[model samples]
Target chain A: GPVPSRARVYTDVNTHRPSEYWDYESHVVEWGNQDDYQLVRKLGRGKYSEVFEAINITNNEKVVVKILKPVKKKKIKREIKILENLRGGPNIITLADIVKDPVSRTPALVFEHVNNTDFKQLYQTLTDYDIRFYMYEILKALDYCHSMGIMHRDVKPHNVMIDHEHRKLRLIDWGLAEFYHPGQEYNVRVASRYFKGPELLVDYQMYDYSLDMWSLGCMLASMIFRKEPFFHGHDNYDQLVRIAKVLGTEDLYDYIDKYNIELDPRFNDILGRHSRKRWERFVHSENQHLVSPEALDFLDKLLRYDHQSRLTAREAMEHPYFYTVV
Target chain B: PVPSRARVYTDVNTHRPSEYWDYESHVVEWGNQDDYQLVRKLGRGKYSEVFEAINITNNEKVVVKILKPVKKKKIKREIKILENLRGGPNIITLADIVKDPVSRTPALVFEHVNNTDFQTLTDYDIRFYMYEILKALDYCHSMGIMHRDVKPHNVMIDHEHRKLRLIDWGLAEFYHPGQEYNVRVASRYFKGPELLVDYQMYDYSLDMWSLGCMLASMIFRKEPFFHGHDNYDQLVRIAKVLGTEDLYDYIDKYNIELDPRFNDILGRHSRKRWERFVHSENQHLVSPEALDFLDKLLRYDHQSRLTAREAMEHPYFYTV
Candidate 1:
């Protein structure tokens, strides 16, 4: 038989090119060609893009220039749509302007430059109460997003920017933003898997916006203790085993079979075919006292296996944990 | 104007022309003449067919998914999955169930989505369209249902709103709190390496890996990420991308390689070509949102992959 030729998945031709930051002195200098702005200092670079602080010469306003090394036109358009819909919250990052460098054809989002660092860094500098304050602000922002039918799929400490002068925290990023109708599933899976909810890990077919609640739990856990994520498996199996160790095997099996899951033989010894009790024992043991009582209450709702059982962002805002400072 | 009962639409005939009969006429002849009327055949699969039907009395639209053989057990299981997944955007709902008199088959009705499957889309659409796919999958994961077969065909888009709907839970499984893992139930093409190594001991991350492959296929427009000539070769293909160093750790820890089938494919040298391939050719085409999400989903172990909810909250989606 002749080998079938594979189909070519289309690239966002307008923005699907490798970024040229490494080749140039800095990302802003290479990608920011608008005459009204002057590139200053580099902020950071991730796997695909880079960020820099630039000054808008016309108004002397400061803005952050985010350059997608190779631009993704679709992502830019999606972000624009999500941000437009997410406008109005003070805790949410505001989009100031959008521009494309004519020479490089790179897409740039001009956001109001936040002068402060992230909560992760701030934790080392500020007191515990100050951290709680930042978290409360984030909850408020997330609550607002959820109320407006939006889910900010990505919610990590790095994504939570701090305003040092005002002692405020703001939720940043809408690259993976999604709209969730009351009864419909909002598709946007495959973000940072570690911070994911148990329901999402178990099944991808019946999830809801409560997923953000799970991330918030992980974020709060990380913030409170300054520890790594609760579930830390290098691979998928270990991750489940790790979760099983925390939550228990019996629970794992009942949960798996209720949804008609079939476990691979590789996990038979650790998570046997019929040992539901063992699975439950493995997941919920030995980690009960790691967090504060109120925070634990929040985590319980956030880490629930059932989507409906999980906490909503609005409810989390009202939790006693957020009110600890007051 | 044509009477409501007499008017018919043939738009669904584009997919499987062979089964595209006059669905509306069939409903009028076989169904309750007082209120219900069929609009068109929505879709078909190995054991069943779906139709878009309307209730004339209420002027409300509903989806009628009819199963062949009318097995009491299968219908019961379908009903169970639907009842368990009453809320959320990913799974289809069970509006009602009945027996179609003409076909004498059991049918599970659901909320109709005015959308098309992602597979029918052009390559240009799949690239930018992946964001929606991830969003729906994330929601499904949050709900605790692993869509064992998450291919492009299973993903649908609302024609009017373009919202993605993850339909087809025929192979879905629910992992309740504190339950032991089941070892049997997953499609071969979308099977994660861990399931192939041991069927009965897998977890929800299998779906994550499958979803990653689906995203890759959407990005590169390819099929079967580890397309091996046989099962042995397939394992080798997977071992190449997610090298043996990590895999051996699991084997040593759980003694999974003790199985004869696993041992047969265990000694091959790790292929560096996979990293070179993914990094050089495919990585550039993927959006940061996709790469970040895929990296988390493609973990060699079932546990390390991002959960549906966590993936939804990552910063990759925040940046433009």
Candidate 2:
């Protein structure tokens, strides 16, 4: 077992649910028969799993086959346990069954398929309202998981599956999802750089559900306002500077000040005072229509340096900005 | 203005004349408040009692706003502002000025919005209604007036027919460039940062802030998103989410002094996120764009909140 680097118990909406969620290290997976499902084509890949579009021979329905990489048995059981605990939640990718190959004993997990759109292209064509509606849908899944006391440490545009035609959205790639046990620092390394929140960049171990809000906010900054990856940091420290350029530096000090998180010396020079850039400033003839009050307010709230002050998924859902589109 | 480009006005009242802005000198042609028979008590405010009424002679529906005990200057200001605003785009028309003959208490009559009490609305509803309010605000500002108070309760919507009207002129006032009007104008919650800091040299952007607060509730389903316990608490509540350092920057840029009480409540926040509020029930009503629009309009510095015309042209609404 790995020791947590620090001590801090962070919880979201779902911290005290069935104790089953609280156990990422203990659950034993009952590997089932792998002949029931067959992979049709490779869909995606991550650090821990290889994903594919697959067919369920038994049910005759489409599903996702996540073939786990050869790793610690403990990590494999953790992911399976999380999926089982999160069953029947809003937009959670349903885990239909778990299996293993007879010869290699390679473990795999099955899930319902969501006909998804490439966010890069899909986001480009979205109307102001389309962005609102979809963003609201993501909040539903994030809120549901956090409420169940779990954290999808890797929430990004890549993991989000949106069948825009059916107006369906699901949060997938739970390989990094974990049950939140407060007072312990999980890995500082999680999430894609462009979608990473401040806590991840700053090495703050106290991050919680609000980390997802920051990722969603980062996506929003790109989705509505910027033509480029909103935060184009070549590295982690550079990423914070990129974010600080927009969200500003003074507040970063405030955030670290409250948490007692040690500041990187490199940030002081790069972290000079930068006023929070106006969202409208980003909206031009190109993106202005989609970057209105609702768009900016949501992004502003999520992109804050202080994770604790980030909006709750429950509060985000009720925000008046999406009253029409959602 | 073409529908493709939104209308933006930097300053509405400055280019206009002072004679039209003269609230003190306007003559009131007082009619009998009884002429519009009261149908029911619709609502009330800090300054007036409102009723759903009918003009007996014309068999027309109307609203009656009876002023509570206030300064005579306040009464004159409301009548004059409404009169000046009447016939403007989306402005609530002044049906007639009336008074209780014996009590000499003043009242205002307006065309009605049917079933105005019927409840919660969507962002789609807010878009049209805010557009209407901005149109009226622009018109009034162009005529050199600012509706110091703009809130959900004041903007009436017969969304059934897609009709929107800006009502309640009790806190409305005529504007004069560089002149210090009363800082004590709007209701507590909708009061702009300038008013909170006793900065009297404010303008049309004040209405934009009020509308911003109003729209926040619609997008997020909060009745009043900034819950201020008092005037100081109001500014504190405002900066809690808007990021307090900006409050300091905004104060410095405008060369204004925030009320000393803000010395404590202002800096506890960097800012807040829009996505956090999204959850099971209200996710449908809320979106990222709603937060963006809200952040723009709720500038701690009233100067940047956007003019009624500029805001109407803003990305918050449909572009084409």
Candidate 3:
């Protein structure tokens, strides 16, 4: 019902790139030998794959092995293409090899192993400065990916691996990442429930790199407020309800109306009128150490209901909050 | 060699009695708190929370700055500074001081000036406002006080009436030669290189650097001429435009050691010409004299910068 709006920044990022770069479906895979890598132990399980700590038999170096689930071939191609495109990017996970078992026909991806402590435990011990430095690294990865016309749809704490001992961060899981086209309507069913951006919740599919900033906001707010999964929604419907409770219903309506987006009817029953909660309300003696005027202002800019209003990852990197780290 | 003191207003407080400069011993005559009713919150700061309030007795609007829990001596200093700078040109008028009877909270009541539109200002409008602030700056400097915090936020303008007032004296300090002052005074964007370089012996010329920031923003249309990411980057941002050669010269003159943190982030660069900033959008605001004035004020060396009095006499204000 309304005019389509392109991303204010990086709208034409993919426009001039070679068709071979973005055309994932037509890409032919050069599969590596399965005998070159051997699985050691299970790392974790996800919706689309099973992960493991593995060894590169070629050099005896540590690696991650991700065996695909029964997902579509197209999804597999897209992830492989994105990882290849974002190769050597700042804090981006390095894709070592792609191998498939001949008998079982299970395809697996091998990546540089990051000795990461689970974010749940890592976030608990992170000081205010540690959080700032890591978050800045997150933006560097996000900005580089966005600069290359890719959007990491699944930008959650789980996807970000922080090797705290080395003070290193890697943005992993390009499985849900997609190349952005200006007017393309994307899948709204991406990102975790708690980290879903307003554009995703309202089904405004024409989102861009700003989506990652919103996800980063959820992570940051959670760390500062000492709330695990800051917006703890039970399901998809309750996700927006949690957001509205903090951002207020009025601004949500304003955001939807701006983009001519119709609200999901599922919200009619569960969503109630909520006044905007000031960011200051979250500050307490427990969280005061992490809370500063710059942090709150940065959080406010990121968590805005309007996707267009959210700061770009590059701009977020230059925010005064990151300045404290140096 | 020791850093030179302020050329002007070096002994304004010295000639005056102890009653003039002594702030700690001064008792604030608390006004009736019931006289003022808080209308709405204006803003909050590190030291105080401000509000738009109505004076019930006089039926007039005023600003009420409620002091947060801080040292009693610090409170006395602000009140005393306001009292001393009360009638100076463009200085915010302190109407009365009040305290809550129960909570014992102190609030300063000030004459409220109508808010003005700033973004829509024309090139000449900027000159006029800039000139107005200079009058306030000169007045404050002449009275032996350095408005250590000077930024767009502190300057209130009622554009309709062509009125301007410099508010927020929380960071203002009396000028004393050979005294080391705190470097953590001004906001990041408007912070002078002296502050970032840890030069505590700066004087009224610090305000000129802030005023130059405001002027450059008006001319170039950048909210802050030098947008540093942090205190360390603040100098780097300035150096980017002014060039590192002159910055090194300033540091060498002051015998200052550059913080080791700057070793990696800052790089050598030639000075960028002010003409480079002038474009189709801001060309109307940029003039030969405007650039000249800005160059003088935004110098790396504090003493090399223009004083408020000297800045007023610059050709940039010739038309106004």
Candidate 4:
């Protein structure tokens, strides 16, 4: 028998990425004129790009200026192509143009502006229904992207820009995001440390859409727990340690053994045999109100050590946790 | 009006034995300073200067809290209270209490956490971390001790590790019911109505008020949300928001003697809506749930505020 891989679900979501779609070589850069937009303020900076709140001078409309910090040509194309693929999808950030700085020839991706309330400030005023409402909307975006054989490798809170008052959400930052191809090994170094999936940490690259579920699990965990990086692992190895502290080392051992994966030697000394901590254990006077059994049940499914066990974004929409939404 | 859930510790201590209130008996044995090595200055505060130090033998990280020239009894109280709540939920771990033998200075060693500034935290981060602090608060209150100071500065949050430890128990005291104690304790901004009114018979509920101020500051983006000038002004600042009518009522119920100055400053005020604080930036921190939670918390009467256990279950967290 073929070696048993744990949680054999969504194994073929990426089966078509190889034959039907573009690879890194197939992408072409179409640059826009830089003179059209003026930078209003420096919005934020990421590993790949410096973002700005810019204005379209010709039309007087607000736009985001994502100026690329020089990186591999393939990395830039991967992002541009993914954004182009997911462009028309629901709440996907519309890429206005790929503009190049005329003086320096530096490439910038132009996008329409979103009136984003920094999520830290925004999450405080939301009702339970508000969280569900926004989460469901993002699932719409997630499902749309996933349906097209896309996995948003980065789905953390910072990437999902929500204009709460407008009750609108746009999934941004497709830079680290990649097209899903079955059995294709993605670079483990894609997502932020706290949002990194177990499969990524364990060096398992055959992960598919379930990777999004794990990231979203961390996202929701932050929302409910109120800790931005719910699993604050110090390093790549410590990341698993933090997750195991919550999800259990016993199960971690099971997943590793089932897949015949090599355990990091460092783990042998540090990994304590941890029992499965019930979500109820995290419930205290501060968070008791958010710790519904359905939410926990959903969190449990998404945070599995086995990536296959994690719920698909489509199935998650129908989960009892979001039963109120539909 | 004090909800039934607002009352703190009448039933907790009344039914329990005297061991619950036991304090001042636990002797503080100051250990050798050579056991710990200072790595970096973690933080400094009013009562104790803090440091991130490593235990020399084990090479483990620990916090060295060098107490300033505070009373010996107060230092012992903090040590004993920390020792009592050592393993309790979210309470900062007190590894050892040591004294610098040469200068006769006392210091406390604690388990270290990589703390981030509370003001920099997100709305839910506020809720998340505060919830953790409440667990520590509940634990200490259950142990019959009250942490007089409950502010953002006292909360040590390792944001990357999702670990929150309630630190700085310098103002912590063992509570006895009907005990008239010092009013000159908590920081001016976080001082409870009882503290301002010179009410001596305060208990765990006092901690809840401090928590209320901190919660308001974080959510409203107002540093020291109640921008009180002086001791009397602190009450007036709080009175302006919660309303003086409730303050008068609270004073009447407790038979609290007015601080005479209140007669000039305090005027009739209707309860200002919590939404009044909501702005373009902070509206996200101001929801109906948050408003409801804060309304209960930032109340004029200390007993009217929700208890830690009761507050944990409040709908504000659900919304969060």
Candidate 4 per-residue lDDT, tens place, A1-326, comes to 11334224334544533543446567567797899999999989897789999999998888999999877888888888777665545788978788987898997999867888776665566666776777788887887677666788888888998887667789999888777666666687878899999888888766777788899999888776666688999988889989988888889988887777877687777778777888777767765566688888888888888887788887888888898885
What tens digits encode model 3's per-residue C-alpha lDDT throughout A1-326?
75487777778868866688789999898877788888899988998799999888888788999999856999999998888776555688988788887676787888878888766555556688988998898987887788778899899988998888768889999998999999998898999889999888888878888898899999999999998889999988899999999999999888888888988799899999999999999888888888889989999999998888899987888899998775
lDDT of each: 0.59, 0.74, 0.86, 0.77
TM-score of chain A of each: 0.76, 0.91, 0.97, 0.93
The sequence of per-residue lDDT tens digits that candidate 3 reaches over residues B1-320 is: 35768878888878888777788646455544656789999889887999999998689999999998577777888889899989889999999887643344778999998977455778788889899999998998888888888998898889889999999998888887877889998999999898898888888989988988988998999888899999999888998999999999988998988889999988998899999998888888888999999989888888888888788899988889
Q: Give me the iRMSD of candidate 2, please.
A: 29.3
Question: Which RMSD does model 4 reach against the true structure?
Answer: 26.6
Runs in model 1 deviating more than 4 A are A1-33, A69-72, A118-126, A182-189, A257-291, B1-320
- Local accuracy of candidate 1 as per-residue lDDT tens digits, A157-253: 6678877785656688777765453334344354476676655554444454666776777776665555577567676556667666656677676
Query: Mind giving the per-residue lDDT tens digits that candidate 2 earns over B1-320?
Result: 00111123434555666556666644454544545778899877876888999997689998888888578777877888877778898888888876643344678888777745553666576676778777788787777777887877777777678777888777777665566768887878888888888877777788888888877776666778888988988888888778878877877776775557767666577777767767676676676666677778888867566677667776767832
Task: For candidate 4, write residues B279-320 as lDDT tens digits.
Answer: 988877666777788777877767667889999998767744
lDDT over C-alpha atoms for residue B114 of model 1: 79
Best by TM-score: 3
TM-score of chain B of 3: 0.97
For every prediction, compared with the true complex, DockQ reads 0.01, 0.01, 0.01, 0.01
DockQ of candidate 1, scored on C-alphas against the true complex (2 decimals):
0.01
Best-fitting candidate, measured by lDDT?
3
Error of 4 at B26 (Å): 70
C-alpha TM-score for every candidate: 0.42, 0.48, 0.51, 0.49
**What is the C-alpha lDDT profile of model 1 across B275-320, one tens digit per residue?**
3445534554556555566677776666677765566566655542
